[PDB]
Design a protein around this ligand. Structure first.
Ligand SMILES: Nc1nc2c(ncn2[C@@H]2O[C@H](COP(=O)(O)OP(=O)(O)O)[C@@H](O)[C@H]2O)c(=O)[nH]1
Ligand code: ALF
Ligand SMILES: [Mg+2]
Length: 318
């Protein structure tokens, strides 16, 4: 009896990131082929994010700290890998001097602070924050770099493990409006659904359209999955993810602006935490059996090992 788990949720919620934590913990570690692929991604992640940051402070009018940096900004503008792939260490090292200089500019860091005014996977900060060893000539990625790297899932990927002598099989699929269209192929013979939610995204708008709120979409999707006949004999467990990023936003940006019906203290983590559980609780018609849920940080490996051992129980006991 091989347990089939399905990883669902909106775009940029941490589905793939979770699936990585599974391989690290329960699967076989990555051979150079995959490792180099992760690096290409990391390099790319760093180059595309900066391009956006350099264009951000321009399109928002923010001035430079040191106006010399213009010329560093120039060096990134014409970078492009849209629908492209391998980005080699030689390529990247040319940009290291530019990247470090720009990142030091307070004008740019301020542009990163107004991130939510546009589209940028904040995973950029971590890399530029330790560009010093990424930008070293003989660099290989760490586990933590890898987990923080980002590639948009444009397909489906089964991933097999045997945890405590029980054969698991997890499927990762894409979360964007375009990709959802594929989901129905994976609904076959699933024993559970791990629904994920980028809980830090109350102030952000969805990428694939300028206007729809990211967290509302998550709720909208959850409502449709959780109340489905097809998934009547299926365990459904909710992962409020990016808890470590959430902590940060809570301090500076308020959810009150975006969710006016919120009635608590907008700068207390738990006031906000409980509200989220409730919102997702509320989209369920069968609020009789309780809402299995966790507050995860999918980049933090221990958190996940802990959290998954619990999830393994919930599922198997049902
Ligand atoms: N800080 C933080 N970042 C996360 C977490 N989970 C995922 N990420 C980042 O979010 C980005 C999107 O992850 P991914 O798994 O590809 O999202 P997906 O589209 O749902 O598969 C990656 O760059 C990850 O580094 C988390 O718990 N905390
Ligand atoms: F939901 Al994705 F890449 F955005 F798996
Ligand atoms: Mg993905």
């Amino acid at each position: 009896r091989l347990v089939k788990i399905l990883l669902l949720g909106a775009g940029e919620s941490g589905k793939s990131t979770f699936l990585k934590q599974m391989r690290i913990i329960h699967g076989r570690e990555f051979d150079q082929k995959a490792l180099l692929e992760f690096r290409d991604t990391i390099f790319d992640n760093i180059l595309k994010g900066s391009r956006v940051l350099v264009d951000a402070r321009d399109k928002l009018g923010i001035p430079w700290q040191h106006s010399e940096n213009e010329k560093h900004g120039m060096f990134l503008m014409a970078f492009e890998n849209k629908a492209g792939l391998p980005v080699e260490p030689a390529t990247f090292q040319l940009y290291v001097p530019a990247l470090s200089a720009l990142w030091r500019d307070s004008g740019i860091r301020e542009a990163f602070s107004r991130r939510s005014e546009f589209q940028l996977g904040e995973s950029v900060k971590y890399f530029l924050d330790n560009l010093d060893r990424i930008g070293q000539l003989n660099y290989f990625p760490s586990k933590q770099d890898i987990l923080l790297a980002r590639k948009a899932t444009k397909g489906i990927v089964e991933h097999d493990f045997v945890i405590k002598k029980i054969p698991f099989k997890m499927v990762d699929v894409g979360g964007q409006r375009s990709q959802r269209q594929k989901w129905f192929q994976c609904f076959d013979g699933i024993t559970s659904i791990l629904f994920m939610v980028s809980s830090s995204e109350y102030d952000q708008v969805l990428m694939e359209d300028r206007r729809t709120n990211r967290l509302v979409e998550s709720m909208n999707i959850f409502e449709t999955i959780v109340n489905n006949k097809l998934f009547f004999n299926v365990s459904i467990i909710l992962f409020l993810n990016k808890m470590d990023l959430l902590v940060e936003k809570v301090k500076s940006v308020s959810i009150k602006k975006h969710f006016p019906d919120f009635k608590g203290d907008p700068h207390r983590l738990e006031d906000v935490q409980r509200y989220l559980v409730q919102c997702f609780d509320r989209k369920r018609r069968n609020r009789s059996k309780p809402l299995f849920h966790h507050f995860t940080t999918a980049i933090d490996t221990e958190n996940i090992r802990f959290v998954f051992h619990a999830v393994k129980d919930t599922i198997l006991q049902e």
